Amino acid sequence: PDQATIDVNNRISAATAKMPDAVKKLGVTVRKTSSTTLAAISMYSSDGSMSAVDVYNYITLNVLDELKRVPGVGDANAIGNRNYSLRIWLKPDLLNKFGITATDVISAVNDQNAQYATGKIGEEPVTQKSPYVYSITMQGRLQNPSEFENIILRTNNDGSFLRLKDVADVEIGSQQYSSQGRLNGNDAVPIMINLQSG
Amino acid sequence: TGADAQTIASTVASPIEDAINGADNMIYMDSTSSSSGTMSLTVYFDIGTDPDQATIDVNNRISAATAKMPDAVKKLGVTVRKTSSTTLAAISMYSSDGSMSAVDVYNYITLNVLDELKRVPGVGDANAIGNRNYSLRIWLKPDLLNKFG
Amino acid sequence: ENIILRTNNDGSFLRLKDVADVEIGSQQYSSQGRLNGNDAVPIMINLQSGANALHTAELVQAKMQELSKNFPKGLTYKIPYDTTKFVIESIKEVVKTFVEALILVIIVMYMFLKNFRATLIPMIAVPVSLLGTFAGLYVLGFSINLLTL
Amino acid sequence: SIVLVLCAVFVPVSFISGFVGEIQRQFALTLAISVTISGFVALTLTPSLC
Amino acid sequence: MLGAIFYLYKAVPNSLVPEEDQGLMISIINLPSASALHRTISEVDHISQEVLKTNGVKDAMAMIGFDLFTSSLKENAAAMFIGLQDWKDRNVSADQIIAELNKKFAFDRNASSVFIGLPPIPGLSITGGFEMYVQNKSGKSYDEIQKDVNKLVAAANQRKELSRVRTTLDTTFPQYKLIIDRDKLKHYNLNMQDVFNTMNATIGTYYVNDFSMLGKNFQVNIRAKGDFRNTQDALKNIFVRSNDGKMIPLDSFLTLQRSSGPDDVKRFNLFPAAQVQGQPAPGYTSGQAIEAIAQVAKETLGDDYSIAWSGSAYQEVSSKGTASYAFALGMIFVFLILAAQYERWLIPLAVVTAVPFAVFGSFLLVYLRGFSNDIYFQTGLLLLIGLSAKNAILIV
Amino acid sequence: MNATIGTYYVNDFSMLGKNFQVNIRAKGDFRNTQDALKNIFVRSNDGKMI
């Protein structure tokens, strides 16, 4: 299996050449994997505690990766996602009231959810030669959803601020539209447990 | 670059680990995530195990995990390679008559010596303690900066 | 240095050197190396995974002796931390232990078999056997090493 | 019996793997091939030479 | 004599393989977490001259401001590579030199300075002694883990078998953050990319691009040469231009605040863990220490913890009691072959009783001489089955 | 287009110990598509919203 997985790997480089540019910028990945399904778990709410998507969120937060843990598992896949999202739900009605386009929210989130920066105090050039050395950071990356809501879209003259919360809702994961599980006529979330190739 | 050890450990180190975990013949793995923006993961395999097989075995699972990485991480890559913690020698270079200071010496090792020693077979690394190569440094003078706006 | 920052109205130029200092590399004041009290830049010579550490150190000292020809002024070098001098030694002392043991058995044998030919005939076992098992190690994919010795 | 009893112990321990195993099997194999040959020399060359 | 062998078995401690005097030894120095490099350069030189006038050492080479373990640059850490005289010149073993130097600096309060010999087998570790990881499966924080592990390393240094137990987990590092007033940032009308680049190009390092000269390929970085007393000073003279030409200083919208967290953070086998290290007290075996760290960790840690060995201790614990199976196998096949070759079930039974005298004499001498129950010793015991039978076969 | 009818990927952020994508999507009531094409504007290079 590995002599094949590498004899493939070797030929992939030759043809990455003639790929459209848009593929390259995402990468062409290869792996040895099995056409299998070791088992398929099913999670659900006995009563009406969790909803049909409160269960999916718990599974994604704790269950799903704790099953990626257990060795020999090729995949632990809840049937309904690729990655996982904080989703901003533009409300186009109020967008047109306040004078904002979608190209303004893309730019606002792109600019105001920035990255990090790191420097040192006592750095022999920028300093005074002192005892003690500190390291200063500046965390321009957002962390809670309430910070996305307060991304300020336009700067009003009367001091106040038109923030993103005034034009869209900001959700957190879930968004079940894609798929739906059933276990014996009951709403349930299917987790298929793959078996590691070999 | 920029992230603290605690975050790098939780969103860079563990994705890679949960992927690599389940390797063929691995005994354990240490992971050290740093405030200097660097993650270092070291997978250990059972005594008497094909090294180069584990290297490609690892490099396989890594491209599967490369999609769960933060966008900033993929941007400048994630690199895996076989290597041993077996330092066999350590050279000392110095100016016997105090003429080459301590940084004229370092400058001479970089250009002429460090490459000639990196050559010679069987040597993995061959590093002077400190800089990676050395860089053209542009030292901003903030006084004259504001002076000229 | 002569990267021009602002274009003026005289037709002159503000250049990067007027607000910054362009010095090329040599960045220390993040690490200092000391040998026996003196300034010195330590080059560490790591060993790549899977390589005869015994031979590779010979090459390192050889090339350093070649680079000595170029070393201007009082720029000399030392290898204060050689790990292979212990290998080379413990091998010498195991060959010592071998030759010593070989003689002590000849004595215990001559003393018991009383005469010479009575002692030379059983001694032929020592080459033929020991010498022979090397043909076995070669076929079974083994190595000469400290444990074998 | 001497040759056999010495392969009796070392041949089976030269099947074990591990840190200990790879260490020990350096001894087991060198001894088992040597004492074996040493028996063959004693069963052929030694009396013949005498 | 049979039961004597039993008691002698208990009295002999266990190890894996000797830790040779390889003519070298190393030193791991660690100034208080806050310290600047020049304090570390200072403290090294003191240690370095005291070391250099110790009997067996020829030379000493020092990597100041460098972590021999995480292989990276930390200013409050140092690593010294000490080389000894030639074996035929020294009256002292390295295990004495190491122990002597360790007793000396056991109280140097300006820095922590451990001395250590090389690993037994070249790749098994960086340094001799042992290495283990205390892993938390509680979910706890590295400041809570820190406290718990501290209680261990404390009790661990009290035991008579251990010596220079430590832990690399350091969560006391002072760290300033720059909180950003996002509202002031847009009032002053600032491009946030321009702001962070300004931050890097001055206090940290901003990488632009590369050029080529002297047949090599160099980086081009921008840093600040400004002489700033405290931090709040610096933020007043570093400026960034608003979208409408205005030049706002960082002092305004950025608000500095001082917290304290880790600098390195370690996971081991999928859990957040603290990296414990140490060596055995002089005259105690590798396995004797391993037995003591473990005993302590059962009195110092809670059920939400476990420990996970590494290197030349992982081997020793993973291969514990592998001595019997190899030895019992040999006895069986020895007995079976002699049963065959001599057509009697009892003629081998009178050979096989020759071995207990061989393991008695082997344990007796190693215990007389203070040696241990290590791999080389157990391999010799296997050879005594074959070699004592040879003596019995000849009679039987 | 992708910020309204489809999903637009901006960037990501870290929270709860995990890393999360940030996606923009319009939640407007689609009476159909030929009228949903009337509430979705995008401004020209000269300020006019089309």
Numbering used by the authors:
A (entry chain C): 101 to 298
B (entry chain A): 51 to 199
C (entry chain A): 249 to 397
D (entry chain A): 447 to 496
E (entry chain A): 546 to 941
F (entry chain C): 744 to 793
The publication says:
Two distinct conformations of CmeB with space groups C2 (form I) and P1 (form II) were captured in two different forms of crystals. In the form I structure, the three periplasmic clefts of the CmeB trimer are closed. Although the conformations of the three monomers are different from each other, they are more similar to the “extrusion” form of AcrB. A channel for extrusion is found in each protomer of our form I structure. We therefore assigned the conformational state of these three protomers as the “extrusion” form. All of the extrusion protomers in both form I and form II crystals share very similar structural features, which include the conformation of transmembrane helices and position of side chains of residues within the proton-relay network such as D409 and D410 of TM4 and K935 of TM10. For the asymmetric CmeB trimer, the conformations of the three protomers display in such a way that either only one out of the three periplasmic clefts is open or all of these clefts are closed.
The Cme locus consists of three tandemly linked genes (cmeABC) encoding protein components of the tripartite Cme efflux pump (CmeA, CmeB, and CmeC), where all three components are absolutely required for substrate expulsion. This tripartite system is composed of the CmeB efflux pump, an inner membrane resistance-nodulation-cell division (RND)12 transport protein that contains substrate-binding sites and transduces the electrochemical energy required for pumping drugs out of the cell; the CmeA periplasmic protein, a member of the membrane fusion protein family; and the CmeC outer membrane-associated protein that is integral to the outer membrane. To understand the transport mechanism of the CmeB efflux pump from C. jejuni, we here define the X-ray structures of this membrane protein, which assembles as a trimer. Overall, CmeB adopts the fold of a typical hydrophobe-amphiphile efflux (HAE)-RND-type protein and forms a homotrimer, with its pseudo threefold symmetrical axis positioning perpendicular to the membrane surface. Each subunit of CmeB contains 12 transmembrane helices (TM1-TM12) and a large periplasmic domain created by two extracellular loops between TM1 and TM2, and between TM7 and TM8, respectively.
